[PDB]
Design a protein around this ligand. Structure first.
Ligand SMILES: [Ca+2]
Ligand SMILES: [Ca+2]
Length: 415
């Protein structure tokens, strides 16, 4: 495990990570209070599967509820107290210790934008009029106000002024706490549209400068004001700009949007297919998450922007063999049976020495997606839903079949 910063000081931790998203949306309903125990017991497996890092659920306790229903998942926490719906503080430490022990870094999901303000019994009480809240200032709309330099969450009445010295300080100390007592190797920043990118850089600088970080910025061009450059920019340029300011890798929503709206050939338009390595290397690719995808149980979870089952293998084949840093959804790996297939690809990625900044070229004369990836050990030829007949039609060298699945729809060759 190589550990540096990118040539632009982006905290990609050597560009060699392979992340497991360690939960699904309904864990709190399906394995109530038992999730950390399950992870502790799976640690050896996760490690054996080839993951270098795991994205843990929000550790901050959440006892919210709303009604079809939800609550307690962590995105509406009331405290920094770890005795929540995923398990106890003690179980968390054991889980973290087991994962860290098996060689898997622990990335914690953190939610700095808002908190369950109205929760009666909480350890954190910030009064109104004092400037701790967004709503302490005039709230025109879902736009920055003087009390909050980002967008608001729903109504914006739970929005924190993360720029308030005492609020900034509060998060900063919790981040240090997670690192010193909960074995945090990094953080996944939730709803980065809600506060300044610069703040993420400060928090990282202050608490875990050399760790891995990733921000989730899900906001399309049409969501910015008409006069904003972003209103007419590509998905790639919007997320790249955030990454440049936060100095953290960013979820590849450009690739997700093409997976959802374009054809397989169009997948070459995510951040990760960018010809500039300074662009590609900060991309954190995924297929689905707790939000966009399905989850076992209750109403199939959230499924806000789910990838159809007929493209699941193709999607994994693509992210596991290409530039950027890939993320595997718990469910595809461990619930739905794609595990064996994902394991082979992880092995293929590792054997070829594919990293965040590896070069990728797309070949125009065949159907589907055809790409050549220059891994540091080997060259891979990837043909998805293609008529390509032999790897030699697009690349020089001697190739062996590495993967052949879904009736030739997924094919990978190594040099
Ligand atoms: Ca690394
Ligand atoms: Ca906000």
């Amino acid at each position: 495990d190589q550990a540096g910063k990118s040539p632009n000081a982006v905290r990609y931790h050597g560009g060699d990570e392979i992340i497991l998203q360690g939960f699904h949306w309904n864990v709190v309903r399906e394995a109530p209070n038992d999730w950390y125990n399950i992870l502790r017991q799976q640690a050896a497996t996760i490690a054996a599967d080839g993951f270098s890092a795991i994205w843990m659920p929000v550790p901050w306790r959440d006892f919210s509820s709303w009604s079809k229903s939800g609550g307690g998942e962590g995105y509406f926490w009331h405290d920094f107290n770890k005795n929540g719906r995923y398990g106890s503080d003690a179980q968390l430490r054991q889980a973290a210790s087991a994962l860290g022990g098996a060689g898997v870094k622990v990335l914690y999901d953190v939610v700095p934008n808002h908190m369950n303000r109205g929760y009666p019994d909480k350890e954190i009480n910030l009064p109104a009029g004092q400037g701790f809240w967004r709503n302490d200032c005039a709230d025109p709309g879902n736009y920055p106000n003087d009390c909050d330099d980002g967008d608001r969450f729903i109504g914006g009445d739970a929005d924190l002024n993360t720029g308030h010295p005492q609020v900034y300080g509060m998060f900063r100390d919790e981040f240090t706490n997670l690192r010193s007592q909960y074995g945090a190797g990094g953080f996944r920043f939730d709803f980065v549209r809600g506060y300044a990118p610069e703040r993420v850089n400060s928090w990282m600088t202050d608490s875990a400068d050399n760790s891995f970080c990733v921000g989730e910025l899900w906001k399309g061009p049409s969501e910015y004001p008409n006069w904003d450059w972003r209103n007419t920019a590509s998905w790639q340029q919007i997320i790249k700009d955030w990454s440049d300011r936060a100095k953290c890798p960013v979820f590849d929503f450009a690739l997700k949007e093409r997976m959802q709206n374009g054809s397989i050939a169009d997948w070459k338009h995510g951040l990760n297919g960018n010809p500039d390595p300074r662009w590609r290397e900060v991309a954190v690719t995924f297929v689905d998450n707790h939000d966009t995808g399905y989850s076992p149980g209750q109403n199939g979870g959230q499924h806000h922007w789910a990838l159809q089952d007929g493209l699941i293998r193709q999607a994994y084949a693509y992210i596991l063999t290409s530039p950027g840093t890939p993320v595997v959804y718990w469910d595809h790996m461990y619930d739905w049976g794609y595990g064996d297939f994902i394991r082979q690809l992880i092995q293929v990625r590792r054997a070829a020495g594919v990293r965040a900044d590896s070069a990728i070229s797309f070949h125009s004369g065949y159907s589907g997606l055809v790409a050549t990836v220059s891994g540091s050990q080997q060259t891979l030829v990837v043909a998805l839903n293609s008529d390509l007949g032999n790897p030699g039609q697009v690349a020089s060298g001697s190739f062996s079949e590495a993967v052949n699945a879904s009736n030739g729809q997924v094919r990978v060759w190594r040099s």
